[PDB]
Amino acid sequence: GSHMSGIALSRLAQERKAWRKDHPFGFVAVPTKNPDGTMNLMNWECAIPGKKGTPWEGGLFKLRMLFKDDYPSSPPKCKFEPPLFHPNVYPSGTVCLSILEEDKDWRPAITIKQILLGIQELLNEPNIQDPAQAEAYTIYCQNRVEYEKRVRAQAKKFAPS
C-alpha cells in the first residue's frame, strides 16, 4: 500500500461519494479493482458521452483517469482508450487541456465532474491554436466536411452496444 497516498485517497473517496449521488447524464466514472477485488481509487475508467446536436452525438467515449500521490495538488492524467481522433488528443490518447495542467488552469478544488465536463466540451470545440495530433488538426483545418465524416464515423463506431 502506498503510505504516500493518504491525502489523495481521502480526497478520492469523497470524490467518488459525491459522483454517485449526483453526476451528468450519460457519463461514467468508476474506480478500477485491484488484482484481487480491492477498490483502486488511483485508477478510474470513465466514459464521456458525445454532446447532442453535434457530430459526436450518440458516441460513448472511454478514457482512463490516473491520479498521482500528490493529487489533488497535481491534476490527474487523462488518456482516451483507445486513442481518439481529435486535434487536442495525442496519438497516445493523452488529452490536452488547460485545467489538467499544474503550471496553468488546474486548481486542487476542481472535481472529476468538472474535468469530465471539460473534456466533453473540448470534443466539439477543439483548440486549433494548440494541436496535439497532426492528422486531426490538418483535416480540421483543410477539409472540415471530411473532418465531420471522420468524427461521425468515430461516434458511430463507439455508440453504446
Place this chain on the structure above:
Amino acid sequence: YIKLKVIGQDSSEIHFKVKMTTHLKKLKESYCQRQGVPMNSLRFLFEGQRIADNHTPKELGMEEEDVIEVYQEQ
C-alpha cells in the same frame, strides 16, 4: 430498503425504494408501468453496465440516493 433515483434524457426525476436484496427485475417492470410504455421499450443502466432482471442491489453494491439512468430500448 434503499433509495434509488431513476432519471433520463428528459431529466424526468422519479425516486423509488426497494430492499437491498429484492429482485431488481421488479423495479425494471415497475418503471415501465409507472411511466406508460412497453416493457422492452426501455433500457436501464448503472455505473455504465446494463441492469439485468436477476440482479441484486447487494450485488451491484448500490447505496442510498444512488442513480439509475434509463434509455429508450433500441
